[PDB]
Amino acid sequence: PIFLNVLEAIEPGVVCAGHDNNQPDSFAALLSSLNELGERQLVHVVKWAKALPGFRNLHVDDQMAVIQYSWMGLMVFAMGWRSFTNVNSRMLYFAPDLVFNEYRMHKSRMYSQCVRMRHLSQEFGWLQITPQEFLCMKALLLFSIIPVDGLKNQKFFDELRMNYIKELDRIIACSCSRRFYQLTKLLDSVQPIARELHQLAFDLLIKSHMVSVDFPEMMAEIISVQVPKILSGKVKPIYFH
Numbered sequence: 001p002i003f004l005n006v007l008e009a010i011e012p013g014v015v016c017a018g019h020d021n022n023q024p025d026s027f028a029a030l031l032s033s034l035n036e037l038g039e040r041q042l043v044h045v046v047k048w049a050k051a052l053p054g055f056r057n058l059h060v061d062d063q064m065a066v067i068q069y070s071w072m073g074l075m076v077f078a079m080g081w082r083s084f085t086n087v088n089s090r091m092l093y094f095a096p097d098l099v100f101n102e103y104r105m106h107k108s109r110m111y112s113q114c115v116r117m118r119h120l121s122q123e124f125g126w127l128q129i130t131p132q133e134f135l136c137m138k139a140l141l142l143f144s145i146i147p148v149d150g151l152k153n154q155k156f157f158d159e160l161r162m163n164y165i166k167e168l169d170r171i172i173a174c175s176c177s178r179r180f181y182q183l184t185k186l187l188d189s190v191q192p193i194a195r196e197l198h199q200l201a202f203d204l205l206i207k208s209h210m211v212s213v214d215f216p217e218m219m220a221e222i223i224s225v226q227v228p229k230i231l232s233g234k235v236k237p238i239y240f241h
């Protein structure tokens with residue numbers, strides 16, 4: 001069980017957003033705390049990804065690119081799991097100090113995206129996703145979005161992605177065919193959600209000075225340098241189906 005030993009050992013712990021929960025639920029306050037949470041989670045996503053089996057086989061530039069394209073999906077998938085295990089998924093458990101109820105979903109001006117994130121969260125229950133299946137699926141999501149012109153060493157990426165798909169198939173095997181279809185459909189469903197959030201993030205960065213929404217340093221860098229490559233079609237998700 002070497003592969004799952006590693007995935008369990010490197011899984012990040014709790015990350016707080018730093019939100020002041022006794023101020024009013026304003027658009028600016030909620031979105032600023034979400035941006036701060038993103039900046040804080042990015043630290044952990046980088047350390048997690050660098051410790052994955054085989055990740056250092058990738059060329060160093062492909063290592064940062066793959067993190068910088070897939071962070072949205074990774075973070076939404078993990079938040080869906082937190083919500084499913086914590087508030088059972090009529091709320092969104094972004095962080096222990098940033099839990100969205102319906103009021104916050106409206107004041108954030110993200111209600112429709114939050115609905116879709118809630119549906120993602122509920123699928124962990126409907127499909128009875130095990131912790132091992134969650135861990136393998138999440139690792140795969142790191143290897144599920146790349147430039148259309150390819151990475152600096154695409155061949156090493158294709159081998160690594162192959163091997164993570166094989167590990168997912170092994171966890172299922174330890175009926176099988178139905179399960180694999182269900183899980184790969186679930187993985188595919190993350191990308192349209194992440195794309196809606198990529199669009200929201202970009203639009204909000206552009207008009208941030210006017211809606212009093214603060215963007216941390218690495219969030220502002222990634223949203224203005226990398227996210228527009230996704231929105232303009234230069235970087236695309238790899239779908240199973």
Ligand SMILES: C[C@]12CCC(=O)C[C@@H]1CC[C@@H]1[C@@H]2CC[C@]2(C)[C@@H](O)CC[C@@H]12
Pocket residue numbers: 031034035037038041072075076079093094095197200201204
């Ligand atoms: C990844 C984050 C923060 C981490 C998390 O749990 C999921 C959540 C999804 C919405 C993102 C948010 C970071 C800040 C963003 C990108 C806002 O700018 C717009 C949508 C927000």
